[PDB]
Amino acid sequence: IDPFTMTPSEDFVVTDRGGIVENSHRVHAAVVDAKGRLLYALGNPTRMTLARAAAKPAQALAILETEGVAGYGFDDADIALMCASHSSEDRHIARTRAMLSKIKAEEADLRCGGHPSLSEMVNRSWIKQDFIPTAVCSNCSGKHVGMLAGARAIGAGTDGYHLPDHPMQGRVKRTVAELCDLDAGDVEWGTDGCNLPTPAFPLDRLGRIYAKLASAADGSDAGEGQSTRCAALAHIFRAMARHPEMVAGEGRYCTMLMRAFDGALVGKLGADASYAIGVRASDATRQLGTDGALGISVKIEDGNLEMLYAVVTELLERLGIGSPDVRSQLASFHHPQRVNTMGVTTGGVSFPFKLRGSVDDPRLAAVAR
Amino acid sequence: TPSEDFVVTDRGGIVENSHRVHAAVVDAKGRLLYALGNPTRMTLARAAAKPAQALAILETEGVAGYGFDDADIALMCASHSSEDRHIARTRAMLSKIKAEEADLRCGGHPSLSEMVNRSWIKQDFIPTAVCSNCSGKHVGMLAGARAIGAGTDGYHLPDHPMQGRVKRTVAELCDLDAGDVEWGTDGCNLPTPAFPLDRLGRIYAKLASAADGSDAGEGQSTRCAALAHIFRAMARHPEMVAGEGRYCTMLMRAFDGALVGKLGADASYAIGVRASDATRQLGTDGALGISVKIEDGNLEMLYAVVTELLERLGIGSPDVRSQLASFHHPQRVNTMGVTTGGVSFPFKLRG
Ligand SMILES: [Cl-]
Ligand SMILES: [Cl-]
Ligand SMILES: [Zn+2]
Ligand SMILES: [Zn+2]
């Protein structure tokens, strides 16, 4: 009610029914440069956050930096599937089996389990057949095959490749902290749905990982000499952008986003409503005030995915990233339909949040909340 | 100032999501006894308003002649799972009023029970009007429109006398002026009210209080008698109010007449508790009402919080509440059988 005392604690996405507030959801977001400097924020941009599957490009880097993995001949689409929370479409299952074959492993070697598909259409096909998904159907199956590959390549057991004491998980933990530029004690660890260790760290550092992806892609495309790590980051970016259907699937936000942007960015979902985007240097990033790549990370405090995709699409519009025509491929996510059982629209979504970082009285405190 | 009351989920002790909780616990006159969050938050009651809409139906002149029974009234109060038995009862109620499915003005939707919906998907079933979770309410409004000789084609429109009756009855049960109730449109295409959350608790306290007064042989107005009947119908036929496995059904079965409870979509909940040792211990001499809203709309968190609140209020025994253990602490087990996290209730009741 007072535009001059607005605060991070008031950064919301709200749904209404005939103008009456239905639900409200707190938003947190960080927009960072290629070194992690914070450029813009919503909510608490340093919120300690479970990255969930948005950490997968970092886990893929740990796989690709494992000595001997290159000999298996994983291609870009295989790397994309390592980075994926796929919809368990037949092509994802088939590629998982092909990756198994490249390392001479079997489905029984996987330590992830089946689950209902992340795609409603795939799940409808499974329901019709009373199909029970198995390990090879896991949305994380590509990451698991990559972890198996790394365990085999260094001569570790494949037994227990998913456990924290295994050297593959030691490599993951170190790689995540290094990409975030954190000490190990500033990264916390739980266990994911796919039964791997999964990291939590300040939300802005998830943005920093993705800014580093995009920055590495810029350096590779420009022909700059790169470290082995930067070359591997550039390869991960390229793989995701070239095979975005491996990263998610038909009708999925990550796939539709990356297809619409045609190489300009990569993006990835984390469960419980986190999202991360790495944006290559562009006219839009320069207008935001940086000379290199950019990273964006978002968390919806209560975990609602429909709201996450609406907010991410709104934030891209506010940041001037893309064109209206590019972002219009995402219109169904930006303003989710609210049509009742008789075809009547009953309400909608609104975005009463305010990006900070672009000028207010110096006496307005922005308390991260 | 409202407290900062949350339910919080974790993964290995690391915070995953948090959800703001609003709750009101009120006496039979609506006086606020305990609260979480903002107990007066303006809130869409959604289907938690259905007992008030059922009252408007039952008070309509001539509706008694159709011979609706207790299970029919329960289905008027329902957000049912569209099980075959709910559809069958909808058709039986249509027949009682000499109407047809084509007269309904609600539409089909995926079932509120995931198990039912999977069964529909396997069979390529397209739900129709008679499968609406609100089908019983719609048959009741048809019945009221026909009973007073109003048109049936537009019984769902705000300008129809049945909707005028509903709008008046809701404000009267809330003890609000008409202008203090706001109205939107529900999923089933009826007008749907919003009012302060504590007033939703007040409606359910009046249900339970009427059940107590009928049980006790008090001189009741026709309205209190009808409220008592609604309470009794819900408690006697809780499977009509929701369905197998649903929180409302399991809650009411566990309590065996001691309370009624009802879900509103987007995570509101209302309970009417008959006077008991537990209510007297809370400091009231009559019935009480409980209303809850999860700010972000998460249903799993709603049922966890409602069950936690019952435990904090002492309502029921530990043995009775243990039937709801699966809702109180939702399972957090991964695809390989490993427990990955849990739910916590850092909130504190304000008295
Ligand atoms: Cl919402
Ligand atoms: Cl949650
Ligand atoms: Zn995983
Ligand atoms: Zn309805």
Author numbering:
A (entry chain B): -4 to 353, 357 to 367
B (entry chain A): 2 to 352
Can I see the authors' text?
Mutating position 48 to alanine resulted in only minor atomic shifts and local conformational changes within the active site area, consistent in both protein chains. In the S48A mutant, the zinc cation is only partially present at the metal binding site, with a refined occupancy of 0.7, as is the water molecule from the zinc coordination sphere. The loss of Ser48 from the Ser48-Lys51 tandem affects the conformational state of Lys51. The major rotamer of Lys51 (refined occupancy 0.7) retains its typical position where it forms H-bonds to the Oγ atom of Ser80, the carbonyl O atom of Ala79, and the Oδ atom of Asn134. The Oγ atom of Ser80 no longer interacts with the Ser48 hydroxyl; instead, this interaction is compensated by an H-bond to an additional water molecule, which likely mimics a water molecule of the triad. A negatively charged sulfate ion, derived from the crystallization solution, appears in the close vicinity of the metal binding site, forming H-bonds to the Nη atom of Arg47 and the main-chain N atoms of Gly188 and Cys189. Notably, the side chain of Asp187 adopts two conformations: one in which its Oδ atoms interact with the Oγ atom of Thr193 and the Nε atom of Arg47, and another in which the side chain is oriented toward the metal coordination sphere. In agreement with this postulate, substitution of Ser48 with alanine rendered the mutant protein inactive, as the L-asparaginase reaction could not be initiated.
ReAV is a homodimeric protein, with each subunit containing a highly specific zinc-binding site created by two cysteines, a lysine, and a water molecule. Two Ser-Lys tandems (Ser48-Lys51, Ser80-Lys263) are located in the close proximity of the metal binding site, with Ser48 hypothesized to be the catalytic nucleophile.
